Write a protein that binds this ligand. Structure first.
Ligand code: ATP
Ligand code: MG
Lengths: 371, 139, 104
C-alpha cells in the first residue's frame, strides 16, 4: 500500500502520497468559523471550514492560525486540520495507511506525547513516526548525516543529524520565519509609504515575497549600488489596480534571516546559529555538518541565498571556502519530499511505531522511537 | 539467584550484546556484567561522571564507559519520572557504532550495549522495563 | 409506507432531489442519457451541481453492499445505483462539463 506524507506547517500544511514528485494538497493552516450570527438551513452549511474551502469562503469566516512559531498550542484545531487532511484532502481513512509526521525542533515532550496519543487513540493509525523537519530536509537531499537549516512559517532552526538521528543538545532556535518576514515586509513597505490593513493586502504582500524578493551576494555592496541599480526596483499589481513598488526592501526582508538586528532583536542569524550549533557538537561530526548543509522551507526561495550562505560561512569559518551549500529547487516541500523518500523505502518498516507499542509503553514511546 | 541471573535475563532474547548492573549506592562497583566485554571495566569514576551534578561537561567530547568513548544524545537521567540516558558509541575510521542505554534504579545502574543494526528504542524499552522491575522490588 | 433506507445525510439527498425534480423525468432517463452523452439538458451550472453532489467511496461501498430488494430505497438512492451501473461515468461527466465550459 502507498503511504501518506503530510507536512503540518505553520503557514501551509501539505499532504500527499509517498513517491509523488509534488504534494497533491497544499492548503493554508487555517480553521474558519462563521463570522456573523445566523442559523437558517441553506442546504446544510458546514459549521467549520478548513484549508482551501476555508480559503475560498474566507470573507464570511473568522480564521484561526493555530500553530504559533512552529509549536502547537491549540490542539482541537490541529485535530480538525488532521481530520481534513485525511478524510477530505486525500480522501482516506487513517487506520490502514502508515502516516509520516513532522515536528518543529526543540518541541516540548508533552506536545510529542499528546500528538502520539491523538494519532493512536482518535485516528487509530497502525503506524506513525515523528521526524524533525530538518532530518526529512536532509533526506530530500539524500544523505543521513549533517546540519540542516530549516526556516518555515513559524520558526527558524539549525539541527545536527547523525546517521538519521538528531542531537537535541546542539539544536539552535532563531525566533523568526516567513510570518515574521511577512510582518517585517508590511512594516518596511509601510515605511516606504503604503498601508496593509486588510486580508487581501496581506496575501498580495505574501505573493510579493513569493515572487520578487531575493538575497544578494553582498549586502553592503548592493546597498552601495541601491540608488544606482536599474534592475533592483520591482513592482506588483493588485487586481483592483493598486501598485506596490519595492526597491532595496527585496533584500531587506530575507536578510533579516542573515541579520536579525535589522528588525530590533539581538539573536544570531541563520549563518551564526548554524556556526554556533556546529561548534556545540562533537568535533568529529563538524566536517560532515559543513559538507551536508541543507537549507529548507519556503523562506529559502529567495534567489541568491546559496552564495550568500556560502560567503557568510566563508566569513565565520576559514575551513569552508570550497564546500557548497546544497539548495534543491524543490526545497519548499523538502520536508514533504524527504518524508516521501523516507516512507516509500522498504528499510523504514521497522522504525514505525505500532499500536501495541503505545499500549504497552504509554505515550513516552515518542521519546524513544523518534530520536 | 544472584545478579548473574539478572544479566542472563538481560541476555535472554539476544538483541543486546552487553549488560551491566553496577552499584552506585551501598556498594559502588560493578555488581555484575557480561565477562570479557566492555562494561565489566566500569570504574566508579565513570559512575561519578554518570551520577554527577554537571549535566553539561559530557557534551563536549562524549564520556567514557568501560574505557570506551561514547556520545550523549539525550539526558533525562536525574529526572525522577524518566531516569533515562541515551548514548551512542563513537568510533574511528568507519567502524560500526552501537546504541547504549543507562538507567537509574533506587540502588543500581542498569547499562545496556546493543548489537550492530539494532535500534536504540528496543534497548531503551527493555532497560526501562528492567529499571521499573527493579524499582518495584525496592532496588 | 416502507422505510426509505439511505446511506447518506439528508443534505445530499435533499440537494439531489431538488436537482433531479427540476428536469421532469425519472432517474432511468437521466442515467441513460448520461451514458448516451446528450448535452441538451446539461449546461455548465447543471453539471457543476452534478459534480458538487458526487458519491463518496464509503457510500458507493454501502450501495454495493445492499444486496436486498431495491424497491425500499429512496429515489435518490435509485439514481445513485443507476449512476453506478454506467461504466466510466465520472470521466464522461467531467468531459462534458469541461467541453461546455471550454466553449463558454
Ligand atoms: N516562493 C516563496 N518565496 C518566499 N517566501 C515564500 C515562498 N513561498 C512561500 N513563502 C513563505 O514561506 C513560508 C512557507 O514556508 P514553509 O512551507 O516551510 O512553512 P511551514 O511549513 O508552514 O512552517 P514551519 O516549518 O515552521 O511549520 C510562508 O510564510 C510563506 O508565505
Ligand atoms: Mg512544514
Amino acid at each position: 500500500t502507498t503511504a501518506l506524507v503530510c507536512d503540518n506547517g505553520s503557514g501551509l500544511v501539505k499532504a500527499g502520497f509517498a513517491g509523488d514528485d509534488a504534494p497533491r494538497a497544499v492548503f493554508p493552516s487555517i480553521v474558519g468559523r462563521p463570522r456573523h450570527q445566523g442559523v437558517m438551513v441553506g442546504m446544510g452549511q458546514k459549521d467549520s471550514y478548513v484549508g482551501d474551502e476555508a480559503q475560498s469562503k474566507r470573507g464570511i469566516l473568522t480564521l484561526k492560525y493555530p500553530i504559533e512559531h512552529g509549536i502547537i498550542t491549540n490542539w482541537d484545531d490541529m485535530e480538525k486540520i488532521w481530520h481534513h487532511t485525511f478524510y477530505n484532502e486525500l480522501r482516506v481513512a487513517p487506520e490502514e495507511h502508515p502516516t509520516l509526521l513532522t515536528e518543529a525542533p526543540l518541541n516540548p515532550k508533552a506536545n510529542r506525547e499528546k500528538m502520539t496519543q491523538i494519532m493512536f487513540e482518535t485516528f487509530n493509525v497502525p503506524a506513525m513516526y515523528v521526524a524533525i523537519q530538518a532530518v526529512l530536509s536532509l533526506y530530500a537531499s539524500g544523505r543521513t548525516t549533517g546540519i540542516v537549516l530549516d526556516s518555515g512559517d513559524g520558526v527558524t532552526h539549525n539541527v545536527p543529524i547523525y546517521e538519521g538521528y538528531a542531537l537535541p543538545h546542539a539544536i539552535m532556535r532563531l525566533d523568526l520565519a516567513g510570518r515574521d518576514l511577512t510582518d517585517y515586509l508590511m512594516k518596511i513597505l509601510t515605511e516606504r509609504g503604503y498601508s496593509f490593513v486588510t486580508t487581501a493586502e496581506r496575501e498580495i504582500v505574501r505573493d510579493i515575497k513569493e515572487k520578487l524578493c531575493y538575497v544578494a551576494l553582498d549586502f553592503e555592496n548592493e546597498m552601495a549600488t541601491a540608488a544606482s541599480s536599474s534592475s533592483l526596483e520591482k513592482s506588483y499589481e493588485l487586481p483592483d489596480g493598486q501598485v506596490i513598488t519595492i526597491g532595496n526592501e527585496r533584500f531587506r526582508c530575507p536578510e533579516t534571516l542573515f541579520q536579525p538586528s535589522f528588525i530590533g532583536m539581538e539573536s544570531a542569524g541563520i549563518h551564526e546559529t548554524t556556526y554556533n550549533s556546529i561548534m556545540k557538537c562533537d568535533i568529529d561530526i563538524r566536517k560532515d555538518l559543513y559538507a551536508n548543509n541543507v537549507m529548507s522551507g519556503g523562506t529559502t526561495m529567495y534567489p541568491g541565498i546559496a552564495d550568500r550562505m556560502q560567503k557568510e560561512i566563508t566569513a565565520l569559518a576559514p575551513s569552508t571556502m570550497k564546500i557548497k551549500i546544497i539548495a534543491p529547487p524543490e526545497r519548499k516541500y523538502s520536508v514533504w519530499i524527504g518524508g516521501s523518500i523516507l516512507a516509500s523505502l522498504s528499510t523504514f518498516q521497522q522504525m514505525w511505531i505500532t499500536k501495541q507499542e503505545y499500549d504497552e509503553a504509554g505515550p513516552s514511546i515518542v521519546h524513544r522511537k523518534c530520536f | 539467584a544472584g545478579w548473574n541471573a539478572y544479566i542472563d535475563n538481560l541476555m535472554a532474547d539476544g538483541t543486546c550484546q552487553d549488560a551491566a548492573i553496577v552499584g552506585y549506592k551501598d556498594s559502588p562497583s560493578v555488581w555484575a556484567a557480561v565477562p570479557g566485554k566492555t562494561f565489566v571495566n566500569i570504574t566508579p569514576a565513570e559512575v561519578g561522571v554518570l551520577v554527577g551534578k554537571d549535566r553539561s561537561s559530557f557534551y563536549v567530547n562524549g564520556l567514557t564507559l568501560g574505557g570506551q568513548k561514547c556520545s550523549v544524545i539525550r539526558d533525562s537521567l536525574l529526572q525522577d519520572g524518566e531516569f533515562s540516558m541515551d548514548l551512542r558509541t563513537k568510533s574511528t575510521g568507519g567502524a560500526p557504532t552501537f546504541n547504549v542505554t543507562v538507567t537509574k534504579t533506587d540502588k543500581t545502574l542498569v547499562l545496556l550495549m546493543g548489537k550492530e543494526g539494532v535500534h536504540g528504542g528496543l534497548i531503551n524499552k527493555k532497560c526501562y522495563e528492567m529499571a521499573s522491575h527493579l524499582r518495584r522490588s525496592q532496588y | 409506507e416502507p422505510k426509505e433506507i439511505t446511506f447518506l445525510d439528508a443534505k445530499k439527498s435533499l440537494n439531489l432531489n431538488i436537482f433531479l425534480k427540476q428536469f421532469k423525468c425519472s432517474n432511468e432517463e437521466v442515467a441513460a442519457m448520461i451514458r448516451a452523452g446528450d448535452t441538451t439538458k446539461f449546461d455548465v451550472e447543471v453539471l457543476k451541481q452534478l459534480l458538487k453532489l458526487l458519491p463518496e467511496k464509503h457510500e458507493i461501498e454501502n450501495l454495493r453492499a445492499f444486496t436486498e430488494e431495491r424497491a425500499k430505497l429512496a429515489s435518490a438512492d435509485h439514481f445513485y445505483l443507476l449512476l453506478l451501473a454506467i461504466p466510466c461515468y465520472q470521466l464522461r461527466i467531467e468531459c462534458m462539463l469541461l467541453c461546455e465550459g471550454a466553449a463558454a
